């Protein structure tokens, strides 16, 4: 019938077993795994999914626990990736306790180390893997933003690759670029899609806001360099951009706002946000209220005045600017000095001076 | 019929979007390198198929066949070589 067969004839003992496993018929699967001797646990349905991949897909923890105890069970590697993809934390814990993962270093080794050995571990059928070959469990957990699954894998020691520079001349980057140059470019985005997710930024590094700010710049530059995947890097840049805003939005007192803005008062992170054009970070009300208090340093009463009053003081500064400058030289540090050093006043002084300059230009041609 | 035409249009794009290595992209674009399916997509105006990043990166490598260093140059440098060629 169908042109393509993805699985023959699926003898009744196996077809009844697959039906039991898929729909969580726990008493039957326990009966068949124990008593039956003419059935293999690796029979597959029409989609090439064995019993384990069916039970994990439908979230059958009790069926999965029964299957994991059965020896020579296949597709255990993919079953973890399927459970991670759907965020089945209890199933992920059940699979990670299998000897296949506890004894081996699969979670700790890099995707390149996993790829150098074929080992057909994460393969889910006769040929191929469910997700991209370079997507390790930690990268897949980061992509789906499973915070608990990311934390579980981080405890196991899994870390994302942190790939090399785009213009890298090392042997590994030279070989990958010459080999495929499309799998390599897709592999770079998959690693960056995991590095830029909030579930990995907050749970991995010591300073998630600083790491996100740097990664936001790094992904924005990659968008210009690799124009074909411009949208892919541009979206990943935004994920880092709104993580920093998300963290800033949670501050509830001035001490917390100080740590986010000043970093470890030189507003280091505000300068970085302006440098990296993280506009929602600078324009957030938590950030603006901090700049506003610095803006009106010693002008306590002038903060709440109307625009008309603030236009009056601009005129007053403009008229008295020669006297204010003379007073500043005579008394650099005084009541006049502190007011004149206020950031708002220095802006008014520069605005007033320019208005006087426009006055001289017009007054010059008054005849 | 216009809606049914779009369902076929975005199935081909959907299949193209799933390619993960150059060998798979070659089969989708070249058919069974004469880009037979790219010509058909242009002939049948399947614009999302041709404009997909997987398809564009394949055309781009053919576009800069022997100009390895010229691929990543700025527009100003590429305007300089146009003047030099002229």
């Amino acid at each position: 019938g169908p042109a393509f067969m993805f699985n023959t004839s699926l003898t009744a003992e196996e077809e009844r077993f697959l039906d039991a496993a898929e729909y969580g018929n726990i008493p039957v699967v326990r009966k068949m795994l124990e008593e039956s001797k003419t059935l293999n646990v690796n029979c597959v349905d029409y989609m090439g999914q064995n019993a384990l991949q069916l039970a994990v897909g439908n979230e059958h923890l009790e069926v999965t626990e029964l299957l994991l105890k059965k020896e020579n069970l296949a597709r255990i590697g993919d079953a973890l990736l399927l459970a991670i993809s759907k965020g089945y934390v209890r199933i992920v814990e059940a699979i990670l306790n299998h000897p296949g993962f506890a004894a081996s270093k699969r979670l700790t080794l890099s995707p390149c180390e996993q790829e150098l050995q074929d080992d057909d571990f994460y393969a889910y059928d006769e040929d191929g893997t469910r997700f991209s070959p370079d997507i390790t469990p930690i990268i897949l957990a980061a992509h789906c933003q499973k915070y608990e699954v990311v934390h579980m894998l981080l405890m196991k020691g899994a870390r994302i690759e942190r790939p090399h520079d785009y213009f890298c001349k090392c042997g590994d980057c030279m070989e990958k670029q010459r080999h495929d140059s499309f799998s390599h470019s897709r592999s770079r985005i998959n690693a960056y899609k995991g590095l830029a997710s909030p579930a990995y930024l907050s749970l991995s590094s010591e300073d998630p806001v600083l790491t996100a700010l740097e990664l936001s710049n790094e992904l924005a530059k990659l968008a210009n360099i690799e124009k074909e995947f411009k949208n892919d890097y541009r979206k990943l840049s935004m994920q880092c951009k709104d993580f920093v805003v998300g963290v800033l939005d949670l501050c509830r007192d001035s001490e917390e706002v100080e740590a986010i803005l000043n970093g470890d008062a030189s507003l280091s992170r505000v300068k970085l946000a302006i440098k990296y054009e993280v506009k929602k970070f600078v324009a957030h009300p938590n950030c603006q209220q901090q700049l506003l208090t610095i803006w009106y340093e010693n002008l306590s009463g002038l903060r709440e005045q109307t625009i008309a009053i603030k236009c009056l003081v601009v005129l007053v500064v403009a008229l008295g600017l020669p006297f204010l400058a003379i007073g500043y030289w005579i008394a650099p540090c005084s009541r006049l000095g502190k007011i004149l050093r206020s950031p708002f006043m220095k802006f008014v002084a520069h605005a007033a001076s320019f208005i006087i300059f426009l006055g001289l230009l017009v007054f010059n041609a008054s005849d | 019929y216009r809606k049914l035409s779009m369902q076929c249009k975005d199935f081909v794009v959907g299949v193209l979007d799933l390619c993960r290595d150059s060998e798979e992209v070659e089969a989708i674009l070249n058919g069974d390198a004469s880009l037979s399916r790219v010509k058909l997509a242009i002939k049948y105006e399947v614009k999302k198929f041709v404009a997909h990043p997987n398809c564009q990166q394949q055309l781009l490598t053919i576009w800069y066949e022997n100009l390895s260093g010229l691929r990543e140059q700025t527009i100003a440098i590429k305007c300089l070589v146009v003047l030099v060629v002229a």
């Binding site: 393509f4 059928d125 | 299949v15 069974d32």
Partner: peptide, 29 residues
């Protein structure tokens, strides 16, 4: 019996159905 093109098409079509059924599971209930 199958050629490389047929094997590749089998891989991509099977990959499509699994992706399509997952995207069906993302629809609103």
């Amino acid at each position: 019996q199958p050629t490389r093109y047929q094997q590749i098409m089998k891989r991509l079509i099977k990959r499509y159905v699994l992706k399509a059924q997952v995207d069906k599971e993302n629809d609103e209930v």
